[PDB]
A paper describes a structure:
In this paper, we report the crystal structures of a lectin from [name], designated as AAL2, in its apo- and complex forms with GlcNAc and GlcNAcβ1-3Galβ1-4GlcNAc, as part of our endeavors to develop a system to facilitate the identification and purification of O-GlcNAcylated proteins. AAL2 was found to specifically bind nonreducing terminal N-acetylglucosamine (GlcNAc) moieties of either alpha- or beta-linkage and was reported to have the activity of inducing apoptosis in hepatoma cells in vitro as well as inhibiting hepatoma growth in tumour-bearing mice in vivo. The overall structure of AAL2 monomer is a single domain with the shape of cylindrical torus with a diameter of about 51Å and a height of about 27Å, showing a very regular, seven-bladed β-propeller fold formed by the blades packing in a circular array.
The structures of AAL2, AAL2-GlcNAc and AAL2-GlcNAcβ1-3Galβ1-4GlcNAc were determined at resolutions of 2.0Å, 2.1Å, and 2.0Å, respectively. There are two virtually identical AAL2 monomers arranged around a two-fold pseudoaxis of symmetry in an asymmetric unit in both the structures of AAL2 and AAL2-GlcNAc, and one AAL2 monomer in AAL2-GlcNAcβ1-3Galβ1-4GlcNAc, while the protein exists as monomers in solution as determined from its elution volume on a Superdex 200 10/300 GL column. Each blade is a β-sheet consisting of four anti-parallel β-strands arranged in a W-like shape and of about 56 residues in length, and is named W-motif according to its shape. Seven tandem W-motifs of the AAL2 monomer, numbered WI to WVII from N- to C-terminus, are organized around a seven-fold axis of pseudo symmetry. The first β-strands of the seven W-motifs are located innermost of the AAL2 monomer and form a central tunnel that is filled with water molecules and almost blocked by a long N-terminus loop (except for a small opening). These 7 innermost strands point to the same direction, from the ‘entrance’ to the ‘exit’ of the central tunnel, and run almost parallel to each other along the direction of the seven-fold propeller axis. What is notable is that the seven sequence repeats observed in AAL2 do not match exactly with the seven blades, but instead have a shifting of one β-strand.
Numbering used by the authors:
A (entry chain A), B (entry chain B): 2 to 404
Amino acid sequence: TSNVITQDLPIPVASRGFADIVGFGLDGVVIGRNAVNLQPFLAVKNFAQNAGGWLTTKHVRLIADTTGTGKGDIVGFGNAGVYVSVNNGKNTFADPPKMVIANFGYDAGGWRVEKHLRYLADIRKTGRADIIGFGEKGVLVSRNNGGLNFGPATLVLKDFGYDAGGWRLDRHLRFLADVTGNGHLDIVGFGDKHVFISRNNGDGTFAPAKSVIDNFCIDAGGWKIGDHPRFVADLTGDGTADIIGCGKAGCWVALNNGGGVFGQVKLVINDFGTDKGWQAAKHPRFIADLTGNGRGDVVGFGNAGVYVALNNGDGTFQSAKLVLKDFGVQQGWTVSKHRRFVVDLTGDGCADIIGFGEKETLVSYNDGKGNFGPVKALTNDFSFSGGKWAPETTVCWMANLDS
Amino acid sequence: TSNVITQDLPIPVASRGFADIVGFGLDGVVIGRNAVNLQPFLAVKNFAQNAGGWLTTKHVRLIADTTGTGKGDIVGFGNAGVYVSVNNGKNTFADPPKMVIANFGYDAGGWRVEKHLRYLADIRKTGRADIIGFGEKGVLVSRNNGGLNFGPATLVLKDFGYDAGGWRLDRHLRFLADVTGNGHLDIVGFGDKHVFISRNNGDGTFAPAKSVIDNFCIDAGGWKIGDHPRFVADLTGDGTADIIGCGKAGCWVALNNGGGVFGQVKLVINDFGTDKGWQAAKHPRFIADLTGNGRGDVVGFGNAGVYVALNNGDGTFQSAKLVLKDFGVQQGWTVSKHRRFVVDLTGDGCADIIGFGEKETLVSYNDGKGNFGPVKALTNDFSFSGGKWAPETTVCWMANLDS
């Protein structure tokens, strides 16, 4: 297992735990705490389409531990800066939220959802999240200095930026993961001709970017943003992030030697790629630990239902098989209306499947071996419900509120 | 609300949160973590009747944060000493447990469930639990030095002991609670003729026992152990512990002024006592916050069902009333086979009711005002299921594993 931050999944969820639902609904933040009587709780009247004027087109809304308590706080990147609603521990969130910094906003620093990435991460391993943004001139970091005091937004690396040199959301990928093996989150960038790494030194600095693979990129191997999803994830159990991507012929991986050196790029699964009919607009794919061994498995929501290929434990894989006859295109699930997640809901380290459907939120539980039980109606809440949870106007995440 | 440790409830549960089931079953520690798919998880194959030789008549089995991570660990006072299974933060408990001190055991120091009390509490307020024992010659403490290092068991107070002077379980009550107002757990002892306090200094030392109330005792008002239950809880909202006892004619309180000095003993509820049929063998009673206002309310499981009296906020009460035709004698609930709990399961700060019955574990949710909804079968697990969960051979607590 590696803790990892991607563009699609900026909020790390524990591989072994009881994931909670956090929804930025139309009228505010709705918490669905993983519990015996799941009931949506309107925790904060803000951070919402119809409370505070929050927009998916202009703002970023996340969950992270900004105080160091181990409790996840609500964080919003608004117009004038970053606002935080502190989780008081005992199921209460501060409302109204407090503005902790005049940077990383639409009006503060000219940040744009179309050009930049903003993440929250404990890059210094101090137990609370720094602000890290992939901006114009490079990677800007504001150190979290306790008590919601954030250091100056500081250009810490002149690379991986819209204007340093030429990073684009329609061409490239920028993730954070420990690939060097020092416990700290590094920068992993899929550029034009190479995957680049910038090592996190440990002390709030990143080394200059270095090329590590001549593949997985738009102009090295023909990897395209829509059609060929790429991931970073521990596939060997050594605790460092390997690389895997769903391409044309199937899934290709390059394994980390444990220090950020990558081996040859090999086809490990002849499925999940375009040759077998997997399309970005229809078929969400994920890497998640479905067997509790700390190694990433491949999960895909295909046409007839969900397909999985299990990791043998060493970065090679078994064949893909259909494991669950639901949550697929045949059953009516769509990327534009519905939300699907692959996360542990039950504390056994084997990821379960939950889907926010048209009118119902459904779940199927992993059996502890990578197989799935009968689908069950968990709640009417969080479902699309004719627009109540439209992707255009709401954001939903799984997160461990108690981490 | 005040943090309180009692003989019947040695483990404090949060008044606002999602309490977890922790059961010491026949085959090991079973965690019933409060979650969407509640299932017994055999976490440690020890601490059990048929795993490690653990017995209700010989050993003490608890949950407490021994490491300071905010996560409850499994702790057992066994034969040769105290054993801990650390909770790693990812629903994993060390197995086998490791011994942390060769004392406070049946063989090590001659501790007896029939004679002595053993608690775990953060009496120094450093984020982790010291061991506190009421033994033969007085109060013995072992300082939790971190990393599971425990200091020598030290006789810190020559009072409250089986042989200093004659404290007996058939007769007296010994609790930990903050009654001085200094934020630290004090010793509260219902002796022969007085309620005694021993103030907690801070350094984890206690001042000589001082008489504070001439009442609530076997020789001061005729208070008997089973028949006339006494509790300590915050009934005023100030964070200091008040005192309430269910006498013959109803509930008498003595209110804390906030500095550990008590007002006149007065009758505030005309029910819950032997006069109105309440009996030690049949009708367990509790103080719990049913309204979320931080003041303790009175709950009793009677004949026809559950009765409550709601605190006005200041230690005076509305009249008692039956809120639920269930969990009572007439529905077949007995103290000898079944377990009943009054704890928040839903994080709204209003305590709910859960019961481990004959073949089923049932729940009724507080509506948020002290009323209760229909009883729902939660799971078949943790139920007597003769006699998988016999009280003679197993132990079940509610606890918040994630503080």
